[PDB]
């Protein structure tokens, strides 16, 4: 349905072109820049447009009535982004009142290990009932990316138009528990400098899930219930649908299952 301006979704990424016409009418707050992978998606404008693009523009977003918090994870956009850079960004978003934090990037790890600063920032989200939604990664293996594999994070893999996991989408074991597949093939979004394009990757599946999460929280608000991002995560996981057959793809490549928006809303009402 519709989002809600009291529901706050943070985009943690590289540069975002807020002047792109699809954001005309979007509710966007830009936090100031402070003094095969990377935590920046390289597609901040596109990612943001998936959620906040306005209904009659070149990119109709999923939750255009939600409040957006644009959080830079960089000081110099050419410089490598560290875990402390990311941890600071998460902290800033929590303190700015984020319900959901979208991280469309990540780094390939051994088994989901992370530096203390990042562990602590993710723990903070958990302590404050903030939902972190993070890209599974595009390495095409039994593999784990760092924000995505951390406790209480909702990891997002990529499936095609026909509901099948894309070969490039990572399928590490922790994702079987906390990962869901969302559309990740040729996803429409804004280009910096104007115009639009369709791109494939877990970077683009991620904001679809963040947008749906924002819609679920928005429905809580109109129901007179207090927004509960960690419950919404549980509902997205619980309603996720099994992949049709395992004779073509794999059972493990399905993760916890496929994003099921109608099922998630049914579960939100305490239905069957």
> Could you state, in order of their start, the residue ranges of all structural domains in the chain?
1-272
> Active-site residue 162, yes or no?
no
Strand partners for 100: 9, 131
Q: Look up residue 137 and give its two tokens.
A: 């990664």
| Structural contact between residues 240 and 26, judged by C-beta atoms closer than 8 angstroms | no
Per the entry, the structure determination technique was X-ray
Q: Which of 41, 104, 203, 239 is catalytic?
A: 203
What is the secondary structure of 27-45 as a DSSP string? EEEEPPPP---BSS-S-HH
Q: Which of 20, 41, 43, 239 is catalytic?
A: 43
> Active-site residue 203, yes or no?
yes
Q: Annotate 178-192 with b (16+ C-beta within 10 A) or e (fewer).
A: bbbbbbbbebbbbbe
Q: Look up residue 252 and give its two tokens.
A: 């493990």
**CATH (one of 3.40.50.300, 2.40.30.160, 3.40.250.10, 3.40.50.200) for 1-272:** 3.40.50.200
The Cα 32–Cα 266 span in angstroms is 39
Q: Annotate 109-134 with b (16+ C-beta within 10 A) or e (fewer).
A: beebebeebbbebbebbeeeebbbbb
| Structural contact between residues 204 and 236, judged by C-beta atoms closer than 8 angstroms | no
Element (H, E) at 155: strand 154-159
Q: Look up residue 76 and give its two tokens.
A: 């110099």
Residue ranges with strand state E in 61-113 = 67-72, 100-103, 108-109
The Cα 4–Cα 7 span in angstroms is 5
């Amino acid at each position: 349905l519709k989002g809600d301006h009291n529901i706050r979704v943070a985009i943690l990424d590289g540069p975002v072109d807020i002047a792109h016409p699809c954001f005309q009418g979007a509710d966007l707050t830009v936090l100031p820049t402070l003094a095969s992978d990377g935590f920046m998606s390289a597609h901040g404008t596109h990612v943001a447009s998936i959620i906040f693009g306005q209904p009659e523009t070149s990119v109709p977003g999923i939750a255009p009535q939600c409040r957006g918090l644009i959080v830079p994870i960089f000081s110099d956009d050419r410089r490598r982004i560290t875990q402390l850079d990311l941890a600071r960004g998460i902290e800033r978003a929590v303190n700015a009142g984020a319900h959901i934090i979208n991280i469309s990037g990540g780094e390939l790890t051994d088994f989901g290990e992370a530096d203390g600063w990042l562990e602590n920032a993710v723990s903070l989200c958990r302590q404050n009932n903030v939902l972190l939604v993070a890209a599974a990664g595009n390495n095409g293996c039994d593999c784990l990316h760092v924000p995505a594999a951390l406790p209480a994070v909702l990891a997002v893999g990529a499936m095609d138009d026909h509901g099948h996991p894309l070969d490039f989408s990572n399928w590490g074991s922790t994702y079987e528990q906390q990962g869901i597949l969302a559309p990740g093939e040729d996803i429409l979004g804004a280009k910096p400098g104007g115009g639009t394009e369709r791109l494939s990757g877990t970077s683009f599946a991620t904001p679809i899930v963040s947008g749906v999460a924002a819609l679920l929280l928005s429905e809580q608000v109109r129901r007179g219930e207090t927004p509960d991002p960690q419950k919404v995560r549980q509902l997205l996981l619980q309603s996720a649908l099994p992949c049709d057959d395992d004779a073509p793809e794999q059972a493990r490549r399905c993760l916890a299952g496929r994003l099921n928006v109608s099922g998630a809303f049914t579960l939100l009402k305490g239905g069957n």
